[PDB]
Design an enzyme around this catalytic site. Structure first.
Site, PDB file in Angstrom:
ATOM      1  N   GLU A  74      -3.422  -7.674  11.192  1.00 48.58           N
ATOM      2  CA  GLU A  74      -2.952  -7.946   9.700  1.00 48.58           C
ATOM      3  C   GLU A  74      -4.064  -7.459   8.649  1.00 48.58           C
ATOM      4  O   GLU A  74      -3.333  -6.885   7.673  1.00 48.58           O
ATOM      5  CB  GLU A  74      -2.758  -9.467   9.579  1.00 48.58           C
ATOM      6  CG  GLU A  74      -1.712 -10.149  10.669  1.00 48.58           C
ATOM      7  CD  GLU A  74      -0.287  -9.508  10.182  1.00 48.58           C
ATOM      8  OE1 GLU A  74       0.139  -8.624   9.893  1.00 48.58           O
ATOM      9  OE2 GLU A  74       0.534 -10.612  10.224  1.00 48.58           O
ATOM     10  N   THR A 111       3.937  -5.470   1.574  1.00 49.15           N
ATOM     11  CA  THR A 111       2.887  -6.159   0.887  1.00 49.15           C
ATOM     12  C   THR A 111       2.237  -6.015  -0.383  1.00 49.15           C
ATOM     13  O   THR A 111       1.747  -6.732  -0.957  1.00 49.15           O
ATOM     14  CB  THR A 111       1.440  -6.150   2.064  1.00 49.15           C
ATOM     15  OG1 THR A 111       1.131  -4.721   2.115  1.00 49.15           O
ATOM     16  CG2 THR A 111       1.977  -6.270   3.219  1.00 49.15           C
TER      17      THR A 111
END
Ligand SMILES: Nc1ncnc2c1ncn2[C@@H]1O[C@H](COP(=O)(O)OP(=O)(O)O)[C@@H](O)[C@H]1O
Ligand SMILES: Nc1ncnc2c1ncn2[C@@H]1O[C@H](COP(=O)(O)OP(=O)(O)O)[C@@H](O)[C@H]1O
Lengths: 296, 296
Positions: free
Chosen positions: B126, B179
């Site tokens: 991540e 993101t």
């Protein structure tokens, strides 16, 4: 028509639970007696003539009235008040009276209110005396154990009984802190990082209570970077004591808006920690979690 | 010498639990196979061409290298991936591959690592891939049930198993939010009152889970005023949909960064709620709380 009862002190905030969390203590406590007279007057007997004895100005006088109105007792009332502790120290001194007052009435005359309703009227007293509801000191005073005020406008209270032993040490500095002055330093805005930190640590504390994990409860309690770093500055040696008893307590934080301090000593060091607090501050109290206002 | 696993999608934030809360879903999920091969190389195949095969870019290759390196494993691995859902939909697609790989490596090579450590490793995927070590999607993917990431360095995860029935409905719009996009909508600062509000409601959701009170859990979940109001604007018909299923669900909110919507339908209205979502979004799936990555 006489009622004698104990209305315990409480500690609000508990670090990351600012304005939500409340912990009910066993001691100190206001001992209150309320005998039902015939005439229509509100008489206030409160030791320490530092506590306004005028019914409309005294907290117990405010709760007292508004409740007779709503329940039409058409009577006046006399209130015997033995103060458990000094106001402006962070131990829900006032809240003790309100909740004590309200619980009295209800117990006395067959009324069968809800603990939540009592918390409700009681707030009327902290509200009609400070302009804010503050069910966070009043709620635990009534429910005992640990409470969370999760909503106002309407009022909601979640209660979690503390069924295990939780030793508590309280230190009361011979200093006074203006609850209000210490509002303006209180930021009006916070960064996302703090929202995330406080939400997580507070949630972790609820988890800790359900898992009876004192170490986890006390460590997360000390994780606030929003309010405690600011409020702590006003408490002499607070940061120094925190560090000093570091490995001997599960946790230590400011009680309410201060200057009183609440610590959860580890069994192996209760005496030693109590001594350290006595040396810095002079007044210390050893207690544990209480069950709220109960007929004496 | 290989292992095959099912790695579930997950839903983070859950309204007032931003960056803390995570719920594991049973479906969709990635099916991931890892085979120990002789040449010290990492080969990756996937059925989604919009996703990298370069071991230094595919989240699965990043986690595998980090672990093979740390444990000085001699072999290399062939990773085959069948994707459960597209990335950018707020269902933790990347996390599913990261958690699944960390879990598969630990099984294939008998590392006996605890769940917390697998979440930490999955976290590099991540990070190394989206700039931040976020674990709120990989935590529920590894642990199953409900999780709270309560600290990031060191990483700390608190797990609350969900042993009662909790029906979930997921609506997946044909839009994406990456993101950088997710960060763009985020407020610069939060008012003190919102902080208090979210702390209280998030803590009530934890209380609700221990009391198996789905109504309380869903209601508090819908209380966020800090992020949901802004994020919801990005989802066609979100507020309208919320209003339409208003009394037929325990709660409804955005899944992770969105644009997917997660709803907890009341048992007597599951078909009606699924149909309403379906009228707005074809890709609607019915599921429930999952148990986390498992060997298949
Ligand atoms: N029954 C009561 N008990 C204590 N304080 C009272 C009471 N009735 C009225 N007061 C007054 O209200 C003020 C309350 O101060 P406060 O901020 O509420 O103390 P605390 O923070 O310990 O609850 C004091 O000035 C006090 O004199
Ligand atoms: N195995 C993988 N599964 C899914 N996405 C991956 C994978 N390996 C690399 N990526 C990339 O990382 C990015 C992740 O987007 P992301 O915000 O993490 O999706 P999600 O929020 O569902 O996890 C995408 O551009 C994607 O192509």
């Amino acid at each position: 028509m006489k009622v004698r009862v104990k209305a315990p002190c409480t500690s609000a905030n508990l670090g990351v639970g600012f304005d939500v969390f409340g912990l009910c203590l066993k001691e100190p406590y206001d001992v209150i007696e309320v005998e039902a007279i015939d005439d229509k007057e509100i008489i206030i007997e409160v030791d320490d003539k530092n506590i306004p004895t005028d019914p409309d100005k005294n907290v117990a006088g405010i709760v007292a009235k508004k409740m007779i109105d709503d329940f039409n007792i058409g009577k006046g009332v006399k209130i015997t008040i033995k103060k458990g502790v000094k106001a402006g120290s962070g131990l829900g001194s006032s809240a003790a009276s309100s909740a004590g007052t309200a619980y009295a009435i209800n117990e006395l005359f067959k009324l069968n209110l809800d603990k939540l309703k009592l918390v409700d009227y009681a707030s009327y007293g902290e509200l009609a005396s400070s302009g804010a509801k503050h069910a966070d000191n009043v709620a635990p005073a009534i429910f005992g154990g640990f409470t969370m005020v999760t909503n106002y406008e309407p009022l909601e209270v979640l209660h979690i009984p503390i069924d295990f032993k939780l030793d508590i040490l309280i230190a009361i500095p011979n200093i006074s802190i203006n609850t209000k002055e210490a509002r303006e330093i209180l930021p009006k805005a916070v960064g996302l990082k703090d929202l995330v930190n406080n939400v997580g640590k507070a949630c972790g504390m609820v988890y800790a209570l359900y898992n009876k994990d004192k170490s986890l409860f006390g460590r997360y309690m000390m994780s606030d970077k929003v309010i405690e770093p600011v409020r702590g500055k006003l408490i002499p040696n607070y940061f120094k004591i925190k560090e000093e008893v570091k490995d001997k307590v599960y946790g230590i934080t400011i009680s309410g808006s201060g200057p009183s301090i609440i610590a959860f000593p580890k069994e192996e060091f209760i005496d030693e920690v109590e001594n350290i607090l006595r040396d810095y501050y002079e007044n210390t109290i050893r207690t544990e979690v209480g069950k709220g206002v109960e007929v004496v």
